[PDB]
Ligand SMILES: O=c1ccc2nc3ccc(O)cc3oc-2c1
């Protein structure tokens with residue numbers, strides 16, 4: 001019969017009402033700077049798609065971050081570039097400073113404003129309940145903006161959230177997998193990290209939307225409040241759904257399949273089986289009690305849903321009682 005089509009509850013036609021140039025990144029022309037304006041100081045870390053270095057700008061002696069892209073299809077490079085330019089200036093969004101071509105490998109290398117190289121994974125152990133709500137609110141600002149700009153991150157994870165805890169700044173990075181949202185378009189499910197992949201990715205439902213980022217956010221929230229990184233610890237893409245099914249229950253799962261008429265892989269039918277929907281009070285123990293609250297659990301539950309349309313939008317999430325104390329202090 002085929003899968004039931006779906007659309008985004010919010011920011012649905014935002015790209016349609018914008019000029020071609022905005023979302024048609026293949027036609028985007030790139031103005032290239034010179035690497036002889038930058039000197040690499042030290043490697044900040046390696047990656048699957050790029051190498052990252054701390055660098056200095058020999059024109060104003062300003063510290064920057066250079067991301068030397070590994071060989072990948074031209075349009076994917078233009079995509080990341082265009083998305084960065086479109087989201088530039090947004091709340092908690094990383095700032096692409098300059099676009100440069102490397103002398104040695106002759107590969108493009110994005111230059112970003114220098115942000116305190118503190119990863120979200122290391123700080124997890126030291127976060128108080130308030131710090132969690134605060135930074136989750138900050139991420140929600142970045143997510144709501146890019147969603148409003150018709151852009152899905154498709155790779156939300158702690159490894160992609162830089163935070164300057166000293167000044168309480170936060171930046172959402174790595175937009176290399178980000179894509180523009182168009183109503184009706186079927187996308188590639190092979191995105192994001194395994195532990196943060198939403199159900200529709202695991203069951204191969206290609207017509208997803210902004211809601212994908214909300215699931216990944218839910219996975220982060222769970223890991224923080226329950227002190228379990230990662231929360232859903234699957235071995236592969238099949239086992240990942242099983243780990244989820246053992247928590248959210250198999251009942252809602254097959255109903256999600258039924259609703260959108262999803263052709264489920266025969267493999268799942270053997271490993272899924274039957275599981276009840278666990279209460280969140282189960283994952284609570286003496287070490288994480290101070291992070292768990294009735295407000296937290298209610299908010300977390302509204303993120304982790306099989307049905308992507310059932311998940312809260314980025315704006316709705318910011319209106320949840322869980323952030324009441326945070327919104328107050330900011331005013
Ligand atoms: O201070 C930093 C450190 C690493 C960074 N890695 C990035 C990777 C991708 C991207 O789009 C932006 C990035 O910005 C960074 C800023």
Ligand SMILES: [Cl-]
Pocket residue numbers: 277278279282
């Ligand atoms: Cl229970």
